[PDB]
Every structure is written in C-alpha cells, then in structure tokens.
Amino acid sequence: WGYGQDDGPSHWHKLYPIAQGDRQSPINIISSQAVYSPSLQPLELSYEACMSLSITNNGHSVQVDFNDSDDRTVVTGGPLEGPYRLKQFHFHWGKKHDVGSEHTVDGKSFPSELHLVHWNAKKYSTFGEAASAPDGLAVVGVFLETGDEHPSMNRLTDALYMVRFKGTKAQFSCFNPKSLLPASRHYWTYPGSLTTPPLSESVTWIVLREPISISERQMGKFRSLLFTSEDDERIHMVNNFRPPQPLKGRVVKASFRA
Ligand SMILES: NS(=O)(=O)c1ccc(NC(=O)CN2CCN(C(c3ccccc3)c3ccccc3)CC2)cc1
Ligand SMILES: [Zn+2]
C-alpha cells in the first residue's frame, strides 16, 4: 500500500476491509459540534529530553523512534485513564501549502500534521498487541502551519538529508518532542483508528487545538524526502495523508468552548 494513484487511500479497503469501519480516522472536526467535556482531566505531556533513538524514512513518512522501556515519556490525563508511553512520532504533509494534514477543522487543512504515537504498555505486553485493542493506543496530533522558523525543528530539518531515500535511518539522540508542542493543551478527542494500514480501531485521538509554526524552508525539506529507494526513479514523498473518514455517530469532545 502507499499514497500513489494505484495504491492510495481510496483503494486500501481492498487489502484492509476495516478501512471502511465505524471508527476510522482521520475525521473532519466540526467545532460547533464538538461536545465541551469539562469532566476530562488535564492533558499532560511529560516528555524527557533524551529518549529519542533514531530517525527513519520508512517509505511512508519520516519517523523518530523512542525508547519505551519505561514511562518517562508519556501522555496522561484528558480522556486517558492511564499513562501511555511514547513510541514514535512522524508527519503527514502535502505537495502544496494548502494541504497535507489528515484531520481538518471545519473543512480546513494545514500543510502538515504531526503524530505522537503512544501505547498502553501498562496493560499490554507489546506495541503490536496494544495496536489491536480499543484502548491500546493514544495518538496526539499537532497541526503545523507555515510562518516563523521553528528553532527546534531545525534539528529534524537538518537530519532529513541523511534519510532522503526510503529504507534509510540514522541515529537521532536527545531530541525532546515537547519542543514540538504548542503552548496550549486544549484539544478535541474522539475514538478512532490508525490512519495507515492496518487501520486498526485502537486509537484514542487527541488533536491539539493550537498549531505550531515552521518556516516554509523547514516545510520544504520534508518535501525533499523520497518515497523511492536509493536505486529507484526518484518520487518525492508528498501528500502522504489519508482524507477525512465518516464520523458514523461518533462524539467528538472538546476540552474548551469555541
Ligand atoms: N498515522 S497514525 O494513525 O498516527 C499511525 C501510527 C502508527 C502506525 N503504524 C505503526 O506504528 C506500525 N505498527 C503497525 C501495527 N503493527 C502490528 C499490527 C498489525 C496488524 C494488525 C494489528 C497490529 C503488528 C503486530 C505484530 C507483528 C507485526 C505487526 C506493528 C507495526 C500507523 C499509523
Ligand atoms: Zn500518522
């Protein structure tokens, strides 16, 4: 599978029938319809500075992996009943500045969306195991818009060169993902799924209300990455996102009032 004209999202269901399930992600968030839920606890992202291991071009996105042997880098509170350890983060972006995010807000996309993937290691033995349970995963999504240069993003920006080709990876020590968070912890949350195959409906989504900003140059580096391996005909990794899926009666909650 992929994001090409033949193996793109509109055809994934042929391999993964859950692609057409009742809690697929992403979705279009209709702000006026989200339910303000003050009963939710505060969302807390307690991330340590040196838990990162590597950066990898897996052919679908560029992903930074973390050491999840313990819970020093977890997301807690909000709709979650316990701590979920950070496993990795990656991005989705477009060819043009007007698209790229997976979730949309009132029909609007951002040039990119960041995904912080966590799993319930407290009750499940492996990430793979948790990825199949309704309460197994928690992904925090952060929208990215272009504007002023993001200081910390340079660390990642300057590393993209080494992984321009599919299947390449490199050591990536001491990157604190907290540096990629906005100053607000307001969010929308709803029960969903992974946005790429196997598309398992095991994700409690937490989409931050406030986006972070990166310069057009930093955004451009992401577009310099390739879907293709070192030998293949260069095909730039762009538009690696899945369109909004049917809500199907799901309730979207908000930690704030619009
Ligand atoms: N954009 S998103 O929604 O934030 C997203 C986040 C992570 C992913 N993918 C992974 O982190 C890679 N996982 C996928 C699940 N894999 C499981 C699995 C496969 C099929 C059904 C359920 C779980 C797996 C388990 C054991 C062996 C191999 C794979 C492990 C590797 C895809 C999308
Ligand atoms: Zn993702």
User: 13, 60, 97, 186: which one is catalytic?
Assistant: 60
Domain limits for position 15: 1-258
ω into 244 cis (within 30 of 0): no
Classify strands 28-29 and 52-57 as parallel, antiparallel or unpaired: unpaired
Number of domains in the chain: 1
What was the experiment behind these coordinates? Answer: X-ray
Of 132, 136, 163, 213, the closest CA to residue 56 belongs to: 163
Structural element, H or E, at residue 46: strand 44-46
Number of the ligand 1 atom closest to the C-alpha atom of 131: 23
| Distance in Å, CA 90 to ligand 1 centroid | 13
Q: Could you tell me the CA-to-CA distances from 230 to 41, 67, 166, 167 in Å, in that order?
A: 47, 28, 7, 9
52 CB-near residues (< 8 Å, 6+ apart): 64, 65, 66, 67, 172, 173, 174, 175, 176, 177
Place of tokens 């994001």: 3
